[PDB]
Design an enzyme around this catalytic site. Structure first.
Site, PDB file in Angstrom:
ATOM      1  CG  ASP A 199      -1.734   1.239   1.356  1.00  0.00           C
ATOM      2  OD1 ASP A 199      -2.649   1.432   0.531  1.00  0.00           O
ATOM      3  OD2 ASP A 199      -1.465   2.032   2.282  1.00  0.00           O
TER       4      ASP A 199
ATOM      5  CD  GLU B 130      -2.392   2.263  -3.333  1.00  0.00           C
ATOM      6  OE1 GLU B 130      -1.574   2.781  -2.549  1.00  0.00           O
ATOM      7  OE2 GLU B 130      -3.622   2.455  -3.233  1.00  0.00           O
TER       8      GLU B 130
END
Ligand SMILES: *[C@H]1O[C@H](CO)[C@@H](O)[C@H](O)[C@H]1NC(C)=O
Ligand SMILES: [Ca+2]
Length: 496
Positions: free
Chosen positions: A197, A233
């Site tokens: 993330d 990401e």
């Protein structure tokens, strides 16, 4: 790390957004395994801040308090039970790792945690890890607000607080060790990979340093020397100082241009038409296929929180959504991820949903269990797109044609296109404002095939449309522009 580590044949992963560990375990055995799904991406499994204003938003799970496997989805025991049951059935588990930061610096100190751990954002004091003021980039950032103000500055984007989230100093071996310790715990439990993330907010080098301390996949389910699958990401569209290629050394990256582009084409916005998909893939400026993780929509941009914008297609636009996902699953580019979400009261007020924060179906904070209807659909407001026949059957389609080349492409110059995959599958689309009636070369062996979009194949009987392929691989297709689903798909395993 570029290898998903899924069973042979399985080519897709699904994001069971905010699902409970116990529901996922069941889903693995009762549906994912039998329907050929490769794996499941889960919501952050570590303890996060319990935000009560608004009431338990979905984004509270992106504000870590500790690394304890204690969340609204379940505890460590339930998480462990899920990984074991899924692996034992051939379905892998990928964890959403939030390692770039902790919770908001403006959050109040106390025990408002999903596990009761104490924390004090004001003094950068997270004892459950433990972390202290010395483990953050508070003195490394230059911006006046202490947060990221200029995205044209790669440095502040990496050392400053992303919208106020306490930014960890991933350059310190102590911090890298604490994170690796948490990630090794998950690996040893049985997870096959991780979603990194906010990778754009971390130096490619710091990430590598962390991956260097990771164990190999559990030797009980994976071959020796297996490395965890890694997809970062990175929201990279056009002309930004940070390029996604900067992370190719750590693993795959999320290609956000995929869904954004496909969305406008299917929506037929700004001159785009399906006949332009003839060279879909790297030809459109996308990252190399072997380094891409693609999707139509994700938990972020499906509610306006991510890249893509208004062109993004979601379950809300079921008809167009199904075609987009159908096209993505049929096309050989990248590794595909299917979305699975829940329904929320969309309150658009001047072009912006004021309820985009709403968390998953719940009873006073307690997440509601996923119920299955007699028609195999879900209740309790869980959309379960992955259970939609059109989507699930396309997931199987990709598995069947895995490795086959993109061939027999056809287009009417507007929005009527078709193409095959070697001699294992063929798909036809009609996104024009008029019926489609034409005989095409499918490149498939003669025989009767069940259209897997309108129906299914069951014991030598089709429950939907049937396509007849001649001795010369030619077949006739009829698709009305008024059809429920304006596309047909047939493959080797749908042949009678
Ligand atoms: C399909 O199923 C029905 C019973 O539901 C049966 O009568 C029919 O013969 C079946 N056809 C084939 C080809 O198995
Ligand atoms: Ca950072």
């Amino acid at each position: 790390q570029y290898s998903p580590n899924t069973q042979q044949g399985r080519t897709s992963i699904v994001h069971l957004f905010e699902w409970r560990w116990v529901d996922i375990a069941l889903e693995c055995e009762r549906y994912l395994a039998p329907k050929g799904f490769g794996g499941v991406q889960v919501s952050p499994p570590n303890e996060n801040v319990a935000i009560y204003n608004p009431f338990r938003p979905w984004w509270e799970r992106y504000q870590p308090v500790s690394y304890k496997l204690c969340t609204r989805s379940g505890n460590e025991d339930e998480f462990r039970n899920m990984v074991t049951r899924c692996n034992n059935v051939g379905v892998r588990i990928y964890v959403d790792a939030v390692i770039n930061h902790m919770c908001g610096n403006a959050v109040s100190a106390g025990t408002s945690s999903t596990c009761g751990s104490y924390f004090n954002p004001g003094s950068r004091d997270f004892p459950a890890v433990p972390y202290s003021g010395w483990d953050f980039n508070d003195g490394k950032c230059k911006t006046g607000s202490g947060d990221i103000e200029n995205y044209n500055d790669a440095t502040q984007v990496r050392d400053c607080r992303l919208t106020g989230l306490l930014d960890l100093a991933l350059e310190k071996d102590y911090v890298r060790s604490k994170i690796a310790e948490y990630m090794n715990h998950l690996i040893d439990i049985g997870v096959a990979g991780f979603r990194l993330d906010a990778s754009k907010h971390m130096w490619p080098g710091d990430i590598k340093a962390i991956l260097d301390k990771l164990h190999n996949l559990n030797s009980n389910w994976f071959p020796a020397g297996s490395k965890p699958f890694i997809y970062q990401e990175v929201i990279d569209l056009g002309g930004e100082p940070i390029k996604s290629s900067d992370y190719f050394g750590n693993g795959r990256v999320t290609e956000f241009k995929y869904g954004a582009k496909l969305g406008t084409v299917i929506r037929k916005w700004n001159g785009e038409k399906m006949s332009y998909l003839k060279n879909w893939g790297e030809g459109w400026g996308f990252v190399p296929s072997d380094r891409a993780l693609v999707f139509v929509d994700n938990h972020d941009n499906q509610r306006g929180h991510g890249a893509g914008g208004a062109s993004i297609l979601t379950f809300w636009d079921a008809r167009l959504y199904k075609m987009a996902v159908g096209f993505m699953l049929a096309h050989p580019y990248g590794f595909t991820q299917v979305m699975s979400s829940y329904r929320w009261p969309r309150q658009f007020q001047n072009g912006n949903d004021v309820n985009d924060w709403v968390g998953p179906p719940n009873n006073n904070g307690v997440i509601k269990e996923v119920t299955i209807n007699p028609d195999t659909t879900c209740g309790n407001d869980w959309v379960c797109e992955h259970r939609w026949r059109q989507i699930r059957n396309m997931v199987i389609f990709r598995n069947v044609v895995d490795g086959q080349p993109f061939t027999n492409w056809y287009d009417n110059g507007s929005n009527q296109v078709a193409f095959g995959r070697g001699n294992r599958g063929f798909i036809v689309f009609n996104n024009d404002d008029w019926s489609f009636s034409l005989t095409l070369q499918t490149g498939l062996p003669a025989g009767t095939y069940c259209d897997v979009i309108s129906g299914d194949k069951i014991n030598g009987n089709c429950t939907g449309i049937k396509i007849y392929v001649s001795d010369d691989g030619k077949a006739h297709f009829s698709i009305s522009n008024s059809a429920e689903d304006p596309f047909i798909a047939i493959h080797a395993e749908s042949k009678l």
